[PDB]
Design a protein around this ligand. Structure first.
Ligand SMILES: [Mg+2]
Ligand SMILES: [Mg+2]
Ligand SMILES: [Mg+2]
Ligand SMILES: [Mg+2]
Ligand SMILES: [Mg+2]
Ligand SMILES: [Mg+2]
Ligand SMILES: [Mg+2]
Ligand SMILES: [Mg+2]
Ligand SMILES: [Mg+2]
Ligand SMILES: [Mg+2]
Ligand SMILES: [Mg+2]
Ligand SMILES: [Mg+2]
Ligand SMILES: [Mg+2]
Ligand SMILES: [Mg+2]
Ligand SMILES: [Mg+2]
Ligand SMILES: [Mg+2]
Ligand SMILES: [Mg+2]
Ligand SMILES: [Mg+2]
Ligand SMILES: [Mg+2]
Ligand SMILES: [Mg+2]
Ligand SMILES: [Mg+2]
Ligand SMILES: [Mg+2]
Ligand SMILES: [Mg+2]
Ligand SMILES: [Mg+2]
Ligand SMILES: [Mg+2]
Ligand SMILES: [Mg+2]
Ligand SMILES: [Mg+2]
Ligand SMILES: [Mg+2]
Ligand SMILES: [Mg+2]
Ligand SMILES: [Mg+2]
Ligand SMILES: [Mg+2]
Ligand SMILES: [Mg+2]
Ligand SMILES: [Mg+2]
Ligand SMILES: [Mg+2]
Ligand SMILES: [Mg+2]
Ligand SMILES: [Mg+2]
Ligand SMILES: [Mg+2]
Ligand SMILES: [Mg+2]
Ligand SMILES: [Mg+2]
Ligand SMILES: [Mg+2]
Ligand SMILES: [Mg+2]
Ligand SMILES: [Mg+2]
Ligand SMILES: [Mg+2]
Ligand SMILES: [Mg+2]
Ligand SMILES: [Mg+2]
Ligand SMILES: [Mg+2]
Ligand SMILES: [Mg+2]
Ligand SMILES: [Zn+2]
Ligand SMILES: [Zn+2]
Lengths: 251, 63, 91, 77, 50, 112
RNA sequence: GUGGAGGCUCGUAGCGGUUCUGACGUGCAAAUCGAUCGUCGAAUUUGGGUAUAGGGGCGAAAGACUAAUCGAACCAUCUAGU
RNA sequence: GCAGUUGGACGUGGGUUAGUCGAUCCUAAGAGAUGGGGAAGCUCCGUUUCAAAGGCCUGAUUUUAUGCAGGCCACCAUCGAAAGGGAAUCCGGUUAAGAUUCCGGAACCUGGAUAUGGAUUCUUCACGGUAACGUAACUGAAUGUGGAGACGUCGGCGCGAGCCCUGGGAGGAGUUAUCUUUUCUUCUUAACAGCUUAUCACCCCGGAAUUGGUUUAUCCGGAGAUGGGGUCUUAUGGCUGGAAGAGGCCAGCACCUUUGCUGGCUCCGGUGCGCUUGUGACGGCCCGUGAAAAUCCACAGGAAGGAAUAGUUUUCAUGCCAGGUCGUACUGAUAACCGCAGCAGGUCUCCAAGGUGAACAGCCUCUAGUUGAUAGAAUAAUGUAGAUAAGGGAAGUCGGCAAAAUAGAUCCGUAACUUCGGGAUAAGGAUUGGCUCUAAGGGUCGGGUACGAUCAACUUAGAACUGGUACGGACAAGGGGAAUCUGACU
């Protein structure tokens, strides 16, 4: 047969991301000395829109403690953050929206975002519009913090890991219908080439496993094992259940 | 000669019109001329003192 | 005068896309095209630049907010939660 | 390319040691419907710019011509 | 093209100098078998493809 | 009703290929290319066009005098007058309050 | 009344290619001509540059397109293949 | 694909002139070395990486050339756009064929040398202004910051330029049985420089409800409105220089001839939902918020260097030198490109007159360009393309295929159904010419501390009269309705 569309995205020719109008990677500041012994102050200069991204970015300016210089940093803006706001980042910083405290030094129930899952990765969990991580508890010995992620998963991560206090801005974005193929087209014009989507069952069997037939039908089960190979995985991979979700997830 | 007769008002009836009234002269253009007239008059009068600012205001927003 | 009974700003879509979809869109379009009160200058001049960016014409301040409203209920709740926890560890 | 309105500056400028050529253009102009008069233009050629002096009085123009240097190459027209 | 490279101009000059018939004293030489110029090119009949 | 041609070899209506029709002493209409128009310099703080400064293309600022590119105030050709006022006031008042924060702590430490 | 929204609409340029199953059908043309038609401010049209190469690509999916070549291109060789 | 004295044919020659136009340079998507690592290997990855990855200012010495004396700095190749970015040029004239390239004249930029004048200093590195800010200038290294470069689309409004239209006058030509103070045409002014000129924006005074100012579009004001007075950007425009000496239109007098020579005029205005284009300030749209780098400037800082019988300054003025290499002719298409060809095909873009008219629609015309395609003689059938037909009116045909009918604008009037937005130009009806009038709709000036004069618009409505009842008179230009199946729509 022929190599199928999902196999063909890994080569990354026309499927790469369109990163022209992106302002940079939204990373936390490097964890150098001040953010693990005291705090460092920076200032929000502007909240800008990032192409390919619903959440706005904040350009925060800090000072270099070792050279006369004005290193700038690109944060994902949390809801309530404004221009001319002083951001405080570090161990001994105050529990206020926009600060970059560690997770050990916040109480339980605290709402944070852009959380390092490992100290020094400079930005992970809860980065998208409206998303946040909840702190649940602490293990001060075995210095660890349990957190609820937006998926519902519970995760144990280092107390030295950092997070921005508050909620990522842009919430409520998926509540509005697009109404238009064109609105979806402009959404995906700046992300990557993954739209429009042709149904495999509307194809020929050379092009897709679900292709073929004198009626449009999948034929075999659309539930594919995890131990299937590239070219077979087209459907519902490793589906524990299937169908309309009737009740609580029981997680 | 045709333009001189157009001036006198000829060759302008319903049978010599092929475009809409708005295509020939837009309602927005007529409105703009009219407001400009009224506002220019009101401002002339307020400056001359024939009218006070309190009457000018209600007449401005009425116009 | 009143030009539409109930579609309002969604009259630009005419008869297309469905009434249920147009109601949802109306509810949020009114919000995102509205003017909001500035917490800093006290004026009714806050408007949306893009999704999540709310700028005031006077005072030129820019706040990160919701996509179609300045403040989400969740963010107000977080503001109050964090205020309560901050006043809890010092007190 | 530059007009001058001071005659002492013009005389100093005629003696600048890069100035080799000058021109005297006579024009017929009108001040109004009553009297047409005779305008004179003294154009001195420097290296970077042409300097032009406009004299509307023929009496002053006549004295200014006499007051020119002899080493200067003058073209009447 | 009017805005052209020196290389293309050079090859064009060589072609202009080649676009000649035979000299006719070459036909009078002892043991001569050249009658005409077989490598003759015209801009209408065959393109150079350079 | 004379008609004009592009006077250079770019045939496309690009920003760099804007033409103005001009009548010449020979009586004919000719297209003359116009350079792109100059943007005014802006304050680093508020972003507003700061007055007094000449409006030129970047390389043309090297041909003009210092007076055409600055005003006679601190941060002259870089920041607005009111922004300079604001930062003067801010500096003075924040340093005074630093002194005050210092003596409050110097009081508390002598007390305890 | 103002205002001037819209993957709205009539309709040019343009993009496409419905019907005449018209002309032509050893043609003007290895796909054109004419009239009639769809659409015509956007999921529009389009130049140049760049990337993707043959069991591979690319595909709003027709097994379509990939230089008049596609249900696996073209060139040479194995090969005077059987 | 007839012809041919002609030719994009044949033969022989001539022809492409740049510091300012491009390339060259920058980066874009991306390509691609080095280091390293894979791979039997051809070679692959990767592009700042797990590298000991460099060169920049000032001098000190005066065997002397340039090391050591110092300090600084850390991007880490390179390629990638003749439409993106970008230092700098215009007029007139000239050739058989070249021109923003040649001639003449008038400018500008960069790079480098440099002297004089000017400015400044014995309060050493200037003064004025309440301020916005101003000026001919009026030190300023490392380092740092900021700006410009550098940016969507649509809508309307404002301003400008060119064009269109048009009055008077100075000239030329045309018509002139009759009429026509008439019809056509010339009356132009570059780059650059100087003075002046602006919406927005900002400053000072002052202190606003009886709320005011104000846009076509409704926003602004005790975070200081209206107002009075000022500062600024110089897009743009005006005046002057350039520059009338040029170019244009004319008259007169000269000649085998190179052929001219001599005189004049080249002026003063107006108008606008006009066309095109640029620009400004606004508004709308987005789960779309609409490049980057080279390059240039400013600021912060204050290293270092500096005057009085004499110094310092070269972002002020003037003056001197130089500006390389390549391209540059021509076609750009019913004959110069691709389609086997001088093929009705295809192939990116700029400029764009008058009339009709909503209209770069169709129709006619001016400028400019063509008048090319084998022709002549006849007018049978059958054709292709165009059309017309009495009475009937889809009986034709699988099927109203094809064609006809309708068609613009103004007024009237508009159903079912409906997601209340639509349906809808629903359906269905009336009118429309020419002429002579009427009415209404405007701008600028005027008034001690109600109006008059003047100037100019095409828009609408109406009445008489008129005609072989014709008048969207050519062109242009929807057929409609009642229902079903099916796909929501674009
Ligand atoms: Mg796609
Ligand atoms: Mg299929
Ligand atoms: Mg299969
Ligand atoms: Mg199947
Ligand atoms: Mg099928
Ligand atoms: Mg009438
Ligand atoms: Mg109109
Ligand atoms: Mg209207
Ligand atoms: Mg100034
Ligand atoms: Mg200045
Ligand atoms: Mg069309
Ligand atoms: Mg066709
Ligand atoms: Mg057929
Ligand atoms: Mg036949
Ligand atoms: Mg494109
Ligand atoms: Mg099939
Ligand atoms: Mg093919
Ligand atoms: Mg055999
Ligand atoms: Mg022949
Ligand atoms: Mg012959
Ligand atoms: Mg490589
Ligand atoms: Mg390069
Ligand atoms: Mg280029
Ligand atoms: Mg650009
Ligand atoms: Mg260019
Ligand atoms: Mg030529
Ligand atoms: Mg010359
Ligand atoms: Mg001075
Ligand atoms: Mg910038
Ligand atoms: Mg806009
Ligand atoms: Mg002039
Ligand atoms: Mg110029
Ligand atoms: Mg004011
Ligand atoms: Mg100018
Ligand atoms: Mg245009
Ligand atoms: Mg040339
Ligand atoms: Mg040429
Ligand atoms: Mg040519
Ligand atoms: Mg062409
Ligand atoms: Mg052509
Ligand atoms: Mg050919
Ligand atoms: Mg070929
Ligand atoms: Mg008209
Ligand atoms: Mg046009
Ligand atoms: Mg027309
Ligand atoms: Mg023929
Ligand atoms: Mg029958
Ligand atoms: Zn505010
Ligand atoms: Zn400012």
């Amino acid at each position: 047969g022929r190599v199928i569309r999902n196999q063909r995205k890994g080569a990354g020719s026309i499927f790469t991301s369109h990163t022209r109008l992106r302002q940079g990677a939204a990373k936390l500041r490097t964890l150098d000395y001040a953010e693990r012994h005291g705090y460092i102050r920076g200032i929000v200069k502007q909240i800008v829109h990032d192409s390919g991204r619903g959440a706005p970015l904040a350009k925060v300016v800090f000072r270099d403690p070792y050279k006369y210089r004005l290193r700038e940093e690109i944060f994902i803006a949390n809801e309530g953050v404004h221009t001319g706001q002083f951001i405080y980042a570090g161990k001994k910083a105050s529990l206020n929206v926009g600060n970059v405290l560690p997770l050990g030094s916040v109480p339980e129930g605290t709402i944070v975002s852009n959380v390092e899952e490992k100290p020094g990765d400079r930005g992970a969990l809860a980065r998208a519009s409206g998303n946040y991580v909840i702190i649940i508890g602490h293990n001060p010995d075995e210095n660890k913090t349990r957190v609820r992620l937006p998926s519902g998963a519970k995760k144990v991560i280092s107390s030295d890991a950092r997070g921005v206090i508050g909620v990522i801005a842009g919430g409520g974005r998926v509540d509005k219908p697009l109404l238009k193929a064109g609105r979806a087209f402009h959404k995906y014009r700046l992300k990557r080439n993954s739209w429009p989507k042709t149904r495999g069952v509307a194809m020929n069997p050379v092009d897709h496993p679900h292709g073929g037939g004198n009626h449009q039908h999948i034929g075999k089960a659309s539930t594919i094992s995890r131990g299937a190979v590239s070219g077979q995985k087209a459907g519902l991979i490793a589906a524990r259940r299937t169908g309309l979700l009737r009740g609580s997830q029981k997680t | 000669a045709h333009a001189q007769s157009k001036r006198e008002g000829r060759h302008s009836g319903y049978g010599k019109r092929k475009g809409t009234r708005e295509a020939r002269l837009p309602s927005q253009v007529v409105w703009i001329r009219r407001l400009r007239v009224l506002r220019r008059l009101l401002a002339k009068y307020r400056d001359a003192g024939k009218i006070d600012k309190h009457l000018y205001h209600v007449l401005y927003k009425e116009s | 005068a009143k030009r539409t009974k109930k579609v309002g700003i969604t009259g630009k879509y005419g008869v297309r896309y469905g009434s249920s979809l147009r109601r949802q869109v109306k509810k949020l379009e009114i919000q995102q095209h509205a003017r909001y009160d500035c917490s800093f200058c006290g004026k009714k001049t806050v408007k949306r630049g893009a999704a999540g960016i709310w700028t005031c014409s006077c005072c030129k301040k820019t706040v990160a907010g919701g996509a179609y409203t300045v403040s989400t209920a969740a963010a107000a709740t977080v503001r109050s939660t964090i205020r309560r926890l901050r006043e809890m560890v010092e007190a | 390319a530059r007009e001058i309105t001071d005659i002492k500056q013009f005389l100093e400028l005629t003696r600048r040691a890069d100035v080799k050529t000058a021109t005297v253009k006579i024009n017929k102009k009108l001040n109004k419907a009553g009297k047409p008069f005779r305008q004179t233009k003294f154009k001195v050629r420097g290296s970077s710019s042409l300097y032009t002096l406009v004299i509307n009085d023929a009496g002053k123009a006549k004295k200014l011509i006499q007051s020119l240097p002899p080493t200067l190459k003058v073209n009447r027209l | 093209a009017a805005q052209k490279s020196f290389r293309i101009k050079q090859k064009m000059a060589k072609a202009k100098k080649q676009n000649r018939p035979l000299p006719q004293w070459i036909r009078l030489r002892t043991n001569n078998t050249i009658r005409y110029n077989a490598k003759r090119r015209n801009w209408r009949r065959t393109k150079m493809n350079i | 009703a004379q008609r004009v041609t592009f006077r250079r070899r770019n045939p496309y209506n690009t920003r760099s290929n804007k033409i103005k029709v001009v009548k010449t002493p020979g009586g004919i209409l000719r297209a003359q290319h116009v350079k792109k128009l100059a943007t005014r310099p802006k304050c680093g703080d508020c972003g507003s066009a700061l007055q007094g400064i000449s409006t030129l293309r970047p390389r043309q600022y090297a041909t003009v005098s210092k007076t055409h590119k600055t005003v006679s105030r601190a941060y002259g050709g870089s920041r607005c007058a009111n922004c300079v006022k604001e930062r003067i006031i801010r500096a003075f008042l924040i340093e005074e309050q630093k002194i005050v924060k210092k003596v409050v702590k110097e009081q508390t430490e002598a007390a305890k």
